[PDB]
Ligand binder design. Sequence first.
Ligand SMILES: [Mg+2]
Ligand SMILES: [Mg+2]
Ligand SMILES: [Mg+2]
Ligand SMILES: [Mg+2]
Ligand SMILES: [Mg+2]
Ligand SMILES: [Mg+2]
Ligand SMILES: [Mg+2]
Ligand SMILES: [Mg+2]
Ligand SMILES: [Mg+2]
Ligand SMILES: [Mg+2]
Ligand SMILES: [Mg+2]
Ligand SMILES: [Mg+2]
Ligand SMILES: [Mg+2]
Ligand SMILES: [Mg+2]
Ligand SMILES: [Mg+2]
Ligand SMILES: [Mg+2]
Ligand SMILES: [Mg+2]
Ligand SMILES: [Mg+2]
Ligand SMILES: [Mg+2]
Ligand SMILES: [Mg+2]
Ligand SMILES: [Mg+2]
Ligand SMILES: [Mg+2]
Ligand SMILES: [Mg+2]
Ligand SMILES: [Mg+2]
Ligand SMILES: [Mg+2]
Ligand SMILES: [Mg+2]
Ligand SMILES: [Mg+2]
Ligand SMILES: [Mg+2]
Ligand SMILES: [Mg+2]
Ligand SMILES: [Mg+2]
Ligand SMILES: [Mg+2]
Ligand SMILES: [Mg+2]
Ligand SMILES: [Mg+2]
Ligand SMILES: [Mg+2]
Ligand SMILES: [Mg+2]
Ligand SMILES: [Mg+2]
Lengths: 260, 155, 188, 131, 167
Amino acid sequence: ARGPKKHLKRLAAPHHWLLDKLSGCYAPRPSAGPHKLRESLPLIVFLRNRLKYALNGREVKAILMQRHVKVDGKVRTDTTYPAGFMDVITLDATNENFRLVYDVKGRFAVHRITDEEASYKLGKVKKVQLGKKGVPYVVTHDGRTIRYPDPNIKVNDTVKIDLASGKITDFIKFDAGKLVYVTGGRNLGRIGTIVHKERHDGGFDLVHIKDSLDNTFVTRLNNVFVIGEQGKPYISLPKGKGIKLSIAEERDRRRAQQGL
Amino acid sequence: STELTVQSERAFQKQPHIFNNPKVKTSKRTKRWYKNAGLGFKTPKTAIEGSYIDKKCPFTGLVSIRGKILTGTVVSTKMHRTIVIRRAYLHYIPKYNRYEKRHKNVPVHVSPAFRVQVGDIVTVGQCRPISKTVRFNVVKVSAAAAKANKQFAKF
Amino acid sequence: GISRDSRHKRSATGAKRAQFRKKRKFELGRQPANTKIGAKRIHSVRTRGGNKKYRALRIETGNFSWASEGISKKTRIAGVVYHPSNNELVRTNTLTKAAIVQIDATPFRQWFEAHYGQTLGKKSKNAERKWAARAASAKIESSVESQFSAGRLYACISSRPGQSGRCDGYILEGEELAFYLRRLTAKK
Amino acid sequence: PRAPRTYSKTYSTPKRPYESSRLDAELKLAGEFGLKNKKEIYRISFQLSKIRRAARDLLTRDEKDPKRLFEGNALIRRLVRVGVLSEDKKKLDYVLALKVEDFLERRLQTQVYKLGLAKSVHHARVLITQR
Amino acid sequence: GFPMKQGVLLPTRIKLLLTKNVSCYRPRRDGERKRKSVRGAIVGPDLAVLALVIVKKGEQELEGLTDTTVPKRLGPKRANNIRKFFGLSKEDDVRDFVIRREVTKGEKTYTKAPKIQRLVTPQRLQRKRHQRALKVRNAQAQREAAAEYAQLLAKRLSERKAEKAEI
RNA sequence: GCCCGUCGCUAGUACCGAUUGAAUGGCUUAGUGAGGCCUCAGGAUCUGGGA
RNA sequence: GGACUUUUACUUUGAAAAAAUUAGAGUGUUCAAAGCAGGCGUAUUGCUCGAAUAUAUUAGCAUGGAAUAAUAGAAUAGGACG
RNA sequence: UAUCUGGUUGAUCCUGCCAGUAGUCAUAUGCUUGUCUCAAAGAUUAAGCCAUGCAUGUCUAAGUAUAAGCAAUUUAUACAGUGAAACUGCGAAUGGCUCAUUAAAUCAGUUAUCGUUUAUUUGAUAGUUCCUUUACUACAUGGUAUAACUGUGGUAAUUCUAGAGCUAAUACAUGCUUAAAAUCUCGACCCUUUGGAAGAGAUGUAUUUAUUAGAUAAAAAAUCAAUGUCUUCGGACUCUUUGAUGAUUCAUAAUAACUUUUCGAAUCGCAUGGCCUUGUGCUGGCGAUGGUUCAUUCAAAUUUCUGCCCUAUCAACUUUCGAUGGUAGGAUAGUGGCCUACCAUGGUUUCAACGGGUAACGGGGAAUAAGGGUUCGAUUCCGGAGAGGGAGCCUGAGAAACGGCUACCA
Ligand SMILES: [Mg+2]
Ligand SMILES: [Mg+2]
Ligand SMILES: [Mg+2]
Ligand SMILES: [Mg+2]
Ligand SMILES: [Mg+2]
Ligand SMILES: [Mg+2]
Ligand SMILES: [Mg+2]
Ligand SMILES: [Mg+2]
Ligand SMILES: [Mg+2]
Ligand SMILES: [Mg+2]
Ligand SMILES: [Mg+2]
Ligand SMILES: [Mg+2]
Ligand SMILES: [Mg+2]
Ligand SMILES: [Mg+2]
Ligand SMILES: [Mg+2]
Ligand SMILES: [Mg+2]
Ligand SMILES: [Mg+2]
Ligand SMILES: [Mg+2]
Ligand SMILES: [Mg+2]
Ligand SMILES: [Mg+2]
Ligand SMILES: [Mg+2]
Ligand SMILES: [Mg+2]
Ligand SMILES: [Mg+2]
Ligand SMILES: [Mg+2]
Ligand SMILES: [Mg+2]
Ligand SMILES: [Mg+2]
Ligand SMILES: [Mg+2]
Ligand SMILES: [Mg+2]
Ligand SMILES: [Mg+2]
Ligand SMILES: [Mg+2]
Ligand SMILES: [Mg+2]
Ligand SMILES: [Mg+2]
Ligand SMILES: [Mg+2]
Ligand SMILES: [Mg+2]
Ligand SMILES: [Mg+2]
Ligand SMILES: [Mg+2]
């Protein structure tokens, strides 16, 4: 309908943000960026709706424009900048670092990380092509382009990215039995090693997954994000470790911790 | 369809960028290109052995099979190089908790690599639009003749 | 302007269809270049998304390659003699892809006799070396060698003059040349 | 273009308009818990109706089916919470019983009277509204 | 009041479709064209005003015209225009040839000059140097990273050759 | 006792009906055809063949 | 990796899947329709639970079943294996 | 949350409808009306018509300041603060509103691009630009023509503008530059071998064409033409380099050329330091704006499978002037009868085509509570369409735009 759409009616806004139905009408429409609209957490949301550091949206621009906030290393000043999964958000003042990884409910959690871990990030490589002049490149889920990767890096492998400098320093192949983080679907936020891949030529590979509770599920290969070895992630996980408790199990945990 | 002639158009029929150098004396006159369409569809031998041209041929032409896979049952072979199949299908109606017979005709391209007749069951594979109505291209014959030669004269 | 929608047009059933929405520019069409021969005239058309397309109307030289010889020269286009689509393109000498044209020969003759030292139809040092190194390899082809005597060579336009602004092509050869030769006289 | 405000109505009117047995039965309640409306009874019968519908449904599911266990237990402790469901009878075939009067005898207007403090439900009403 | 328009010919008035960069129309909006009445270029008794331009001077002076003279509002601003308006050669340094306009502040007289442009200055030359530098500095950096990869490829081949001679 | 139809009064509805009756809306033949676009020209003026 | 595969219906489990609505959990908006809040302290420089679940049916995808109901098979053998 | 009752008879049991009863995010109207919270609302009829006002404008240290503007102090005799106006850039293609059209259309779920365009955001990305290549090309940086303005004017009348005189750039228009290397072609010469050579040109990216590489289905041999590297000069060639997809003529590269030749920074702001042969030399900090190609993101455009209300007092329909297919072209961002040539005779239908109706936008949904159903959805979210009716088009990444233009009709 004539051109690019610029608004977003709250209600059409993605749910994992947790915005209230009333109080306004629109939700902030995520800028074009390194993460898709529907799977992103705009800076406005993070600074005010999660960290509670700002009350106004107008106060969020106030915070940002002093370059207090900086994403994956760079300063960044875009109220609705599309922060996304694996990104690293930093506040120099307040000496605070953050990673965007998922809940178990499929929400972006406030997860505090050490200055040391704020060094780097993890990127799923999403395609590996031959660039102009024969220079091979990889391209990761957050749309970084990295020239001259290791030949043994293929698609779906995950990659340790420097940040300070753009380079790669490692890569975990997509083998049977490797720590996986689920990034979409219902099983969003669950974690579980990998059992086996259903091939399916020309239409969606299924990836059978089992966690550290001997529980099993299945997602499309698209939704699967390797992050290390069973036992050994390559980043700190949120509390929960992505195990998914039954509504009963959750009930009891909450009503077992009852006495003030 | 094709049959005979092959060089029977106003334009000279050729496979693009498949050059045969006249300087180099060859023993097969014309260099021929083909692929396999994938999804484990055998490129039949008439496609390679052949000399027909068809740039809408799944195996010797510039189409690709991607998308859907449909198996219909062929109900008309009157159009040169294209067929119409009847897709055989069956359809539920909740209020009455029974079904009702339905059908849909589909037009599909058919390479001279295949030799289809009315009655054959035919597996078709989706491709880019190829004509006003055709979005499908034969790809494999599950049939044969449907007991034709088993109907000759008396004893 | 010219719409390329399908939504005019009867449905495969034979049914008539109602108008739903007006013409959109993104289904638009433009008019034919109908490019002719001689004295360079080329206009740009502004296409979708920024982007130029070059409408050659009138052209006198194109870049033409002698496939089997692995070289390509720029020549005058003498022009048109056979067209598979429409014979008025020929009579009007109109330039389009697939047009059979005659080109010039002289640039290909100069090359060949410089490269082979053999001359078509009818004393340097290393040059002698190279020529003698070639041949058993200079054996041309009957129906091409004969074209040079007339100073005019058959060629199939292979570019799209109305889109690219270039009128480029290859020299006819082998069976393909045989083919248009046969038409060229089985109609003359 | 703003989120709709959701509402619900909270009562239900009896089909037969003039059934004197039901009409007596309703009035007695009105004068026994100091109500002002047939609606204040119509309301509770509606609250009940769904609680019962809920319970009915769960009962049709298997003994110790996950949903049954989760939402059934939850429904019970909610009911126990306010004092409609007695402690002993605590497993939903009794909520399946229950009764309008059980819900009534837990209103603040009645509890204010039940232990002294008012002596007559009507004094008890007047006291409540008057802050 | 309708204006004349060079080129139309005609001694009447006509309505024309005008564009950007044409007389008798100032477009309000990019790509806007308006249809507008226009008077022809040929003179006739219908004209309220003829616009003449003395090309050369008669035998006598015309009062408020040849006997009064009014100076150009603005002086040369761009570096070389200052050069040509005084004929100077790139040696003389413009800075002092730039014109200066006086203005009184009651009991203060101020002097304000333009701001020369395309004037060659230290700051510019520094930015020329710098870009020249980056192009080369990158170029060499870009060569290294290739060679180092060629290494990674070379001694990978040297793993698949001490492997393919192990078993 | 019941009860059928023509005939007569009031009121209502629909039907047939000269008027080759009327009206609105959607498509459309043939004829005429604005305008922008594309194109063969043109060349007030104004440059270095071009605008 | 090569070489080939009689067709279907039905059923199962799962994936992919907007929110709001709906069913429904948690939480005393004073109640309630709602809302998605809120709750604890050192109430002087903070601690903390949430923001579930279900449904989502026809068609398409993916996995298990082999009853029921169809299809096809070797009889002028142009049958089957090697 | 599985209920019925009144009325045909003298009375009776039925069939059967009328009436009662109950709800309605269901509208109107009548009467009556105190408090809290909540809060729909010119859809239905007339996508009928509209007085006036408002609803789209916009500036950072960082494109353009000689306001004959304001301000003065504070280092500023080029400029330097602040800033009207104007140029330039960007935006006005979002939003908001309505439901007229629309019945295989749209829409939903599910697909496809190996079928394309894509401002912007994000990440990558450029040593090649000149020239018969010693008396040399502005790089210490090349060209004017214009607004605002001054001043002369025209009309009853508008966001009308004319003649004259100025002056800017990240507007317009031009136009230099940088290492080493390797490979190709030519070849002055010398010498006959088995044969080699000084030095001459060409090789950025993009555009167009033609050509070749892009292997791999397990292993080996001979010969013909050209021609590689190493000679223990009969001869050997040993190790020989390979990306992605289910699938490609894919990504990428190589050869011969082609082009009214695309891009390859003449831009701006803060800082002013190092280095010695003391040239105002040579270096050099942070980050703005820009820029080609690729990727990403926001998109778009088409597209697969299945699903629509009433209707036979609609049975055959489709090619007038494309209906269904084949070939070639043209056009398009691109597939395609999209359009044009040639050729053929196809395409749909009782499993309801084709035609008609709809007081028809689709969907999420709403009402009604045993279950199965029935009715509704102009309308808070998604999709589509429109801006009195039609068509045409300029700008632009994006519009067939209407708070844009153009014509016709009202
Ligand atoms: Mg935004
Ligand atoms: Mg796919
Ligand atoms: Mg035919
Ligand atoms: Mg034309
Ligand atoms: Mg400047
Ligand atoms: Mg299911
Ligand atoms: Mg939900
Ligand atoms: Mg009676
Ligand atoms: Mg009676
Ligand atoms: Mg009697
Ligand atoms: Mg009734
Ligand atoms: Mg309304
Ligand atoms: Mg209206
Ligand atoms: Mg000033
Ligand atoms: Mg809108
Ligand atoms: Mg000029
Ligand atoms: Mg520019
Ligand atoms: Mg080989
Ligand atoms: Mg390979
Ligand atoms: Mg290619
Ligand atoms: Mg200094
Ligand atoms: Mg009728
Ligand atoms: Mg009949
Ligand atoms: Mg065709
Ligand atoms: Mg004709
Ligand atoms: Mg016919
Ligand atoms: Mg019917
Ligand atoms: Mg309607
Ligand atoms: Mg609706
Ligand atoms: Mg409806
Ligand atoms: Mg309506
Ligand atoms: Mg519109
Ligand atoms: Mg109106
Ligand atoms: Mg019309
Ligand atoms: Mg319009
Ligand atoms: Mg508008």
